[PDB]
Enzyme design. Structure first.
Site, PDB file in Angstrom:
ATOM      1  N   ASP A  88      -0.350  -7.522   0.963  1.00 28.32           N
ATOM      2  CA  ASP A  88       0.176  -6.163   1.160  1.00 28.32           C
ATOM      3  C   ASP A  88       1.681  -6.249   1.054  1.00 28.32           C
ATOM      4  O   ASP A  88       2.392  -6.303   2.076  1.00 28.32           O
ATOM      5  CB  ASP A  88      -0.301  -5.531   2.484  1.00 28.32           C
ATOM      6  CG  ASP A  88      -0.024  -4.072   2.583  1.00 28.32           C
ATOM      7  OD1 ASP A  88      -0.386  -3.443   3.587  1.00 28.32           O
ATOM      8  OD2 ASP A  88       0.547  -3.520   1.617  1.00 28.32           O
TER       9      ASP A  88
ATOM     10  N   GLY B 106       2.987   5.806   9.090  1.00 26.29           N
ATOM     11  CA  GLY B 106       4.345   5.953   8.535  1.00 26.29           C
ATOM     12  C   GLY B 106       5.276   4.835   8.838  1.00 26.29           C
ATOM     13  O   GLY B 106       6.321   4.719   8.189  1.00 26.29           O
TER      14      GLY B 106
ATOM     15  N   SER C  70       4.455   1.799   8.328  1.00 28.87           N
ATOM     16  CA  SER C  70       4.155   0.764   7.338  1.00 28.87           C
ATOM     17  C   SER C  70       5.326   0.499   6.443  1.00 28.87           C
ATOM     18  O   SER C  70       6.062   1.429   6.042  1.00 28.87           O
ATOM     19  CB  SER C  70       2.963   1.099   6.489  1.00 28.87           C
ATOM     20  OG  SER C  70       1.755   0.949   7.268  1.00 28.87           O
TER      21      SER C  70
ATOM     22  N   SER D 115       2.148  -3.939   7.750  1.00 30.80           N
ATOM     23  CA  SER D 115       1.013  -3.621   6.942  1.00 30.80           C
ATOM     24  C   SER D 115       0.119  -2.526   7.510  1.00 30.80           C
ATOM     25  O   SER D 115      -0.406  -1.686   6.774  1.00 30.80           O
ATOM     26  CB  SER D 115       0.168  -4.847   6.657  1.00 30.80           C
ATOM     27  OG  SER D 115      -1.026  -4.601   5.938  1.00 30.80           O
TER      28      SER D 115
ATOM     29  N   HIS E 143       0.811  -1.203   0.000  1.00 33.91           N
ATOM     30  CA  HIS E 143       0.000   0.000   0.000  1.00 33.91           C
ATOM     31  C   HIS E 143       0.860   1.277   0.000  1.00 33.91           C
ATOM     32  O   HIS E 143       0.352   2.357  -0.205  1.00 33.91           O
ATOM     33  CB  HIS E 143      -0.965  -0.017   1.173  1.00 33.91           C
ATOM     34  CG  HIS E 143      -0.366   0.299   2.472  1.00 33.91           C
ATOM     35  ND1 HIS E 143      -0.059  -0.667   3.434  1.00 33.91           N
ATOM     36  CD2 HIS E 143      -0.026   1.486   3.004  1.00 33.91           C
ATOM     37  CE1 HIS E 143       0.417  -0.074   4.501  1.00 33.91           C
ATOM     38  NE2 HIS E 143       0.473   1.251   4.268  1.00 33.91           N
TER      39      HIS E 143
END
EC number: 3.4.21.12
Length: 198
Positions: free
Chosen positions: A63, A141, A143, A159, A36
């Site tokens: 993801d 952030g 992720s 994720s 993502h």
């Protein structure tokens, strides 16, 4: 730039995420991160300077993504831990109850335990299946960032999680935290990537 798990990178000079792990694909340098975080051909920058582009991604459903890097980049078998690091020694699956740590640009290096496996996240954008859940805190952030054991085994990449109004879930009890990670091995296998280890 030095490629290290957990560090900040920007996408399209618009959004921020965290590096997962240094990897190679033959002679091509790269890093794994969350899907993502970017779209195919999106530009990645570290310190505001171009380092590469999104080579491939899957989101939602899965993801996962990797960023193909210029040859000038310096791959390190490392995950950031404050002013120190943790050496990546290999990869493993991790079982419910395992002690783990994650690293990212918003909340830094945070530790906890694996609380569940095979979790589906019903994100607004779409469902993501097969996730690992832990109780380490995170924020917006983080992720894409590393999930590792303190002994140096890479487990996954961040994720998502139940972020609160302050931008993280560090302010709520650990029992209430849902921090979610994509397992690393399917990423390496899908894309023909080799983890950089030390």
């Amino acid at each position: 730039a030095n490629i290290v798990g957990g560090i900040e990178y920007s996408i399209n000079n618009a959004s921020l995420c965290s590096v997962g792990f240094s990897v190679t694909r033959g002679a091509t340098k790269g890093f794994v991160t969350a899907g993502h975080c970017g779209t195919v051909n999106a530009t990645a920058r570290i310190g505001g300077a171009v380092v590469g582009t999104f080579a491939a991604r899957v989101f939602p459903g899965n993801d996962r993504a990797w960023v193909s890097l210029t040859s000038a980049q310096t791959l390190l078998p490392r995950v950031a831990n404050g002013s120190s690091f943790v050496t990546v020694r290999g990869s493993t699956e991790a079982a419910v109850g395992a002690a783990v740590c994650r690293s990212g640009r918003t909340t830094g290096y945070q530790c906890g335990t694996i609380t569940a496996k095979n979790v589906t996240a019903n994100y607004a954008e779409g469902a993501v299946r097969g996730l690992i859940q832990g109780n380490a805190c995170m924020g917006r952030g983080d992720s894409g960032g590393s999930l590792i054991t303190s002994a140096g085994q890479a487990i996954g990449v961040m994720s998502g999680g139940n972020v609160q109004s302050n931008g993280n879930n560090c302010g709520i009890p650990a029992s209430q935290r849902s921090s979610l990670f994509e397992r690393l091995q399917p990423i390496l296998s899908q894309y023909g990537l080799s983890l950089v280890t030390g």
